[PDB]
Scaffold this active site. Structure first.
Site, PDB file in Angstrom:
ATOM      1  CG  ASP A   1      56.345  24.394 -11.103  1.00 35.25           C
ATOM      2  OD1 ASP A   1      56.905  25.040 -12.030  1.00 35.25           O
ATOM      3  OD2 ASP A   1      55.213  24.727 -10.767  1.00 35.25           O
TER       4      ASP A   1
ATOM      5  CB  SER B   1      67.092  40.033 -18.429  1.00 33.79           C
ATOM      6  OG  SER B   1      67.981  39.951 -19.524  1.00 33.79           O
TER       7      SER B   1
END
Lengths: 330, 7
Positions: free
Chosen positions: A35, A199
């Site tokens: 995770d 991004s």
């Protein structure tokens, strides 16, 4: 040193991936969900209240000759889905894919929430975010990656998740056979303890790329790709039967649709998520409605590049003193 | 049965 381990989806939807990890001496193999959105290594154990254990493999520290109780230390964690667990802490040897760490804190669950008891395939979690998020008190414990970095050939670990198929988690080396082109690296902010990056934009299908900054986290332990509402609305607007459904909790669309691809930017490079990966699965077996794999982050508070996005790429978690995140096509 | 892993 290096290690390499096969990670496998737990079901035919790729809801999550498990990776065997050997804990203790002799080794006790448990399948953990790796995770990158948390920093605790915790397991079901012989300490977990009996009625809260439903098929999982438990660690039994009294059978490990290398286990040591960390006196005084306790932990408690909750996750984004509302699930939670807590208990006490041992150190022990932990190996992944032949890479062994001694004195790793293994968090032993005394209690786990209903969602973990119902997940028979997941024996615990292996947290690979920054160790500032670890929940052990009074002194936080390092993740398995932080403890490995002194012995690794290179301070790095890569995730190569498959689409309905096994993948690999490598530690300490970059497998240049596993991707195509070159890797583009982008800066990570560790201010929130996450593998957090920005991004440079997105495109839908064969449309225009829009430069707009999307700060999000790379989280192997979240299934779907959660993006700002107006970006996700732009995507589903290209799918003629898609609608937002309050009853099921997100955009659904006819399973018989061919979905456009979704591209996101990493610096000057482009990562393209094939339409088929965004077709997450029918909402019920036999349904003609399918649940989409890109959903709105508005309710979450942060944008999350979960398994639908990461399994389209080879991703390098570079844990040098100034960390970075690398993406290549594969 | 999607997963959403710290809060």
């Amino acid at each position: 040193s290096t290690g390499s381990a096969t990670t496998t989806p737990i079901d035919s939807l790729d809801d999550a991936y498990i990776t065997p990890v050997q804990i203790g001496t002799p080794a006790q193999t448990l399948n953990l969900d790796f995770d990158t959105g948390s920093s605790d290594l915790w397991v079901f154990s012989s300490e977990t209240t009996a009625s809260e254990v439903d098929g999982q493999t438990i660690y039994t520290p009294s059978k490990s000759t290398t286990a040591k109780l960390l006196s005084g230390a306790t932990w408690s964690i909750s996750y984004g889905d509302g699930s939670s667990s807590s208990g006490d802490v041992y150190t022990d040897t932990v190996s992944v894919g032949g890479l062994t760490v001694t004195g790793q804190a293994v968090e032993s669950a005394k209690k786990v929430s209903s969602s973990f008891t119902e997940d028979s395939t997941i024996d615990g979690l292996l947290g690979l975010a920054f160790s500032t998020l670890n929940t052990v008190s009074p002194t936080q414990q390092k993740t398995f990656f932080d403890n490995a970095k002194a012995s690794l050939d290179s301070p790095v670990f890569t995730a190569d998740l498959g689409y309905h198929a096994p993948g690999t988690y490598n530690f300490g080396f970059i497998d240049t056979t596993a991707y195509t082109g070159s890797i583009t690296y982008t800066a990570v902010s560790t201010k929130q303890g996450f593998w957090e990056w920005t991004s440079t934009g997105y495109a839908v299908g064969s449309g225009t790329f829009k430069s707009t900054s999307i700060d999000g986290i790379a989280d192997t332990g979240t299934t779907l790709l959660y993006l700002p509402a107006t970006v996700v609305s732009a995507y589903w607007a290209q799918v003629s039967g898609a609608k937002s459904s309050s009853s099921v909790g997100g955009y659904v669309f006819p399973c018989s649709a061919t979905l456009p691809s979704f591209t996101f930017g990493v610096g000057s490079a482009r990562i393209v998520i094939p339409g088929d990966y965004i077709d997450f699965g029918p909402i019920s077996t036999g349904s003609s409605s399918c649940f989409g794999g890109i959903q709105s982050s508005a309710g979450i508070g942060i944008n999350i590049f979960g398994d639908v996005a990461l399994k389209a790429a080879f991703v390098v978690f570079n844990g040098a003193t100034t960390p970075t995140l690398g993406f290549a096509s594969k | 049965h999607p997963f959403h892993x710290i809060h």
